[PDB]
Amino acid sequence: QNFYSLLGVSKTASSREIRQAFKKLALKLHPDKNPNNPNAHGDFLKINRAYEVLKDEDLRKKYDKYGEKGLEDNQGGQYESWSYYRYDFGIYDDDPEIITLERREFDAAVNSGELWFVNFYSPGSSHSHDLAPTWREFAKEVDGLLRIGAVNCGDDRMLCRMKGVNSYPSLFIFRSGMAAVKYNGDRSKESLVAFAMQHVRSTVTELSTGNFVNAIETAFAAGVGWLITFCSKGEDCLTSQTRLRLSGMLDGLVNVGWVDCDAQDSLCKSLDSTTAYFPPGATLNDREKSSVLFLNSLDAKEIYMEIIHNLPDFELLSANQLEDRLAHHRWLVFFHFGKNNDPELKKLKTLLKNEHIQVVRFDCSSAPGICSDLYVFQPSLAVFKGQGTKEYEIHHGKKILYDILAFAKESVNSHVTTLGPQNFPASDKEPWLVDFFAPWSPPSRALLPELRKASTLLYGQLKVGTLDCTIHEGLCNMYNIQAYPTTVVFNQSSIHEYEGHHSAEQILEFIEDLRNPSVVSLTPSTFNELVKQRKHDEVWMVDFYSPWSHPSQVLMPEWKRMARTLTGLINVGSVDCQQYHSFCTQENVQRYPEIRFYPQKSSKAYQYHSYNGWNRDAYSLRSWGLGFLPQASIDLTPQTFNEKVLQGKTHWVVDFYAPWSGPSQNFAPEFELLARMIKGKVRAGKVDCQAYPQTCQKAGIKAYPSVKLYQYERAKKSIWEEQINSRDAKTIAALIYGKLETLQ
Ligand SMILES: [Cl-]
C-alpha cells in the first residue's frame, strides 16, 4: 500500500530491501540535510514512520491487515542523525556476497554445512569502518569458496554477547562440525584468505604418469571427475595456492591434481599453459578428446565457474525408485515437470552428508499422481524425513545454498507437518498449532524456522502444521485469514490466535499460557482441594457455567480478560455445570452463569458472595472482586491531611473523591490495591471532598476522583506534589517507584 509505495518497494520486499530504499530517502531528506524548510521534520516523518512499521514485523502485520487505521500514532518520531544513515546504517546492504545475519537465523545459517566467516561489527566503531571495504573485497574474492557474513552488534547485542564478541570488530569462523574459531590477524584481504584456507578441506595430488592414467581410468566408477593442471618449466600453470582454492571450491565434486610435465615428458606429448577438467570417463587419448574441457585461465573463480556449470545434475529417480525409498532415508527432492537454478546447488550432495540427507530430482511428468497427491503443481523443492514416515516440508524463498541447507537440516530434525485438506485436523480433540501462511510473504518465511524450533520442544504436547494459502486459497478463506502469517492454536473446540513476535521463545510462552490459563478450570474434586481448603489468605473468583447458556457464553471472554488482570492477586476458577451437574447442584447453583467470590478465611466471613450486579463485563467483575480485599488507605480529615501529608516526612498517594461520584466508586477498590502494593514504601490516603470541600478546594481538585502523589525530599525538608492521571494500580505504582529511586 502507501507505506511500500512511500519507500518505493514491493509488499514482498525483504528487510534488506526496505533498509536499502529507506537509506536512499533518508540521506536526501533528513532534516539535517535541508535546514531551509520548516517542514523538514514532517517530511521525514512520513518516510521514517513507514520504515519503522515495515521493519517491525508485528507492526507490519497490522498494516497489512488494516491500513494506517489499525496502527497507532506514536511511531516514526525518533530518528538517528544524518551521519548515522550515511556511515553507520546498512553498511553491507549493497554487497550481494555478504549475508546480513540477525539473531533468529544465525545459528542455523552458520552451521548449515558451509565454511562461514562472519564479521561482528558495530556502529560508532572506527575499527569496524576500516574493515568494511576489505570485507566487501574479501567476500568478492572468496565467492564459491566460503560464506561471508556480517552481524550488526549495534542491532544485535545479545547475539554478539552470546558469541563471545570482545571487541569491535570481531571475526569468527564457523562450521557445523567445530566450535567457532577467532581470527586475530591484521584484517588484510590476503591474510583473511590464508586464515580461511587453513580451515578449508583441500586435497590436491601430484600425479605420476602411472597415477594419472589410473586416476583417469578409475574416475568413472568413482563418479568424480578430475581437474588437472600440467606444469612445465619456463611456462605458467596454476599456482599452489590456486589449486588448493579450487580444491576447496569443488570439494566432493571434483578431484584436483597437477602433473610435472618435465617429469612426465611422454605423457605431456599428447597435450602439446593448460588446465584440463576430465568428466568421469573422459581420457586424454584422441578418442575421449571431446568430453575433456581444456582451460587456459590461471584464475580460480574463472575456472570454478566453468567447472560448476559443467557438472552433472542431481540423480534422477524414477517413480518406482521414489516410492521405494521415500519413507526410509531422508531425501531432498527437486520436483520438476519435463523440460528434459544455481549450479552452486550441486554442492548439496556433499554438504548434507553429515545429516544423511540424500539429494535427488524427480520428473513429475513421469508420474503426475505422485506430485499432485503432494499438491505439487509447479517445480518445487521438498525434504522428506523418512524413518518410516512420509512427513515432508516444502522450501520457500530464494533457492540459495546455505538457505536450502539450513532448511533441510532444521526440517528433518523438527516436527512441522505440511498440511493439506486431506490431513487437516478438522475433527481432532488433540492440540494443534497451525500456521496459515503465504510463501511470497517475507514475515511468513521468517516464521517457519521459529515454528520448527518450537516443534522440537512441543513434541508430545501438540502437533505443529503449516498450510500454504497460495495453494489452498479455499481453506485459508474458511478460517478468515486476512494477513500472512496467521498463527493459530486448536484446542478443545476453542480456537486461540497468536499475536506475539515471530520467535520460538514467545510462541512457547503463548502456548504455555494456553496450557496453564489464568482461568483455572475446576472439577468437583479440585474445587474442594483448592477453593474450599484455600489457605487463610487466598481468595477465589469462580464462574459456574453451562456451555449451553447464552449468558454463560457471553461471560467467558470477559471472565478470561478479567482473570489475566488478576494474576498474583485473586485466584480465578471456572466450573462446567453441564459436565458436573450433581456437584453444581451440591453447591446450589440455580442459574447460569453464577459468579461467586470466596473471601479470606476470617471470624465473620461469609461462605461466599454471589455477584448479582447488572453489568458482567471484565472491569465490573474485577472491581467487584478487588472490593473484598483489605483497605490499606487511611481516611483523612482536614487536620490529618495537613499534619500527615503536607507537613509529614514521607511519601503519600491521595485519592480525592466524592461518595456520590460514580467514577469514584469504580476506582476505590483499584486504589486499595495500589495502597497494598506500595505498603512500606508509600502511604495511601483518601479525602472525602463532599465532607471536606475546604481541603479539596485548597489541594487543587477540579473533579472526582483525583489522585495526587506527595513526595518527601529529606534534603530540603519538603513535600512535592504531582497528579496521577492513570487509574491503573500497576501503572501508577511503577510510575511512583520510578520517581523514588531518583532521589535515593
Ligand atoms: Cl572501536
509: three-class secondary structure by DSSP: helix
Q: How many Cβ atoms sit within 10 Å of the Cβ of residue 186?
A: 8
Residue in the structure block whose three cell numbers are 580461511:
196
115 and 147 in contact (C-beta within 8 Å)?
yes
| Cα 270 to ligand 1 centroid, rounded to whole Å | 59
| Cα 127 to ligand 1 centroid, rounded to whole Å | 5
| Cα 98 to ligand 1 centroid, rounded to whole Å | 22
Say which CATH superfamily domain 200-312 falls into: Glutaredoxin (3.40.30.10)
Give CA angle at 69 (66, 71), nearest 5°: 85
Strand partners, 684: 653
| Cα 88 to ligand 1 centroid, rounded to whole Å | 13
In Å, how far from its chain's centre is CA 167?
A: 26
| Cα 132 to ligand 1 centroid, rounded to whole Å | 13
- Phi (first) and psi of residue 245, to 5 degrees: -65, -45
* CA nearest neighbour of 518 among 599, 629, 621: 621
Q: Is residue 384 packed enough to be buried (19+ CB in 10 Å), middle (13-18) or exposed (0-12)?
A: buried
In Å, how far from its chain's centre is CA 424?
A: 25
Q: How many Cβ atoms sit within 10 Å of the Cβ of residue 189?
A: 15
Core vs surface per residue 438-469: b (16+ CB within 10 A) or e: bbebbbbbbbbbbbbbbbeebeeebbbbbbbb
| Cα 128 to ligand 1 centroid, rounded to whole Å | 7
| Cα 140 to ligand 1 centroid, rounded to whole Å | 25
Q: How many Cβ atoms sit within 10 Å of the Cβ of residue 21?
A: 20
| Cα 48 to ligand 1 centroid, rounded to whole Å | 28
| Cα 129 to ligand 1 centroid, rounded to whole Å | 9
Give CA angle at 445 (440, 450), nearest 5°: 165
Residues with CB under 5 Å of ion ligand 1 are 125, 127, 168
Distance in angstroms (rounded) separating the CA atoms of residues 187 and 135? 9
In this structure, which topology does domain 517-629 adopt according to CATH?
Glutaredoxin (3.40.30)
What is the dihedral sign for C-alpha 314, 320, 324, 327?
positive
| Cα 345 to ligand 1 centroid, rounded to whole Å | 38
Distance in angstroms (rounded) separating the CA atoms of residues 625 and 590? 21
| Cα 91 to ligand 1 centroid, rounded to whole Å | 16
Distance in angstroms (rounded) separating the CA atoms of residues 341 and 350? 18
523 and 582 in contact (C-beta within 8 Å)?
no
| Cα 168 to ligand 1 centroid, rounded to whole Å | 6
| Cα 169 to ligand 1 centroid, rounded to whole Å | 8
- Domain 313-414 is found in CATH 3.10.580.10: no
DSSP string, 183-239: E-S---HHHHHHHHHTTS---EEE--HHHHHHHHHHHHHHT-EEEEEEE-TTS----
Say which CATH superfamily domain 91-199 falls into: Glutaredoxin (3.40.30.10)
Sequence ranges of the chain with CATH classification 3.40.30.10 = 91-199, 200-312, 313-414, 415-516, 517-629, 630-744
| Cα 356 to ligand 1 centroid, rounded to whole Å | 43
Provide the pairing of β-strand 225-231 with 254-260. parallel
Q: How far apart are the first and last CA of the chain?
A: 51
DSSP string, 370-429: HHHHTT--SSEEEEE--TT---EEE--S---HHHHHHHHHHHHTS-EEEP-TTS--SS--
- Phi (first) and psi of residue 486, to 5 degrees: -120, 115
CATH of 630-744, one of 3.40.50.720, 2.40.50.1020, 3.40.30.10, 3.40.50.2300: 3.40.30.10
Residue in the structure block whose three cell numbers are 526410509:
328
Q: What was the elucidation method?
A: X-ray
In this structure, which topology does domain 415-516 adopt according to CATH?
Glutaredoxin (3.40.30)
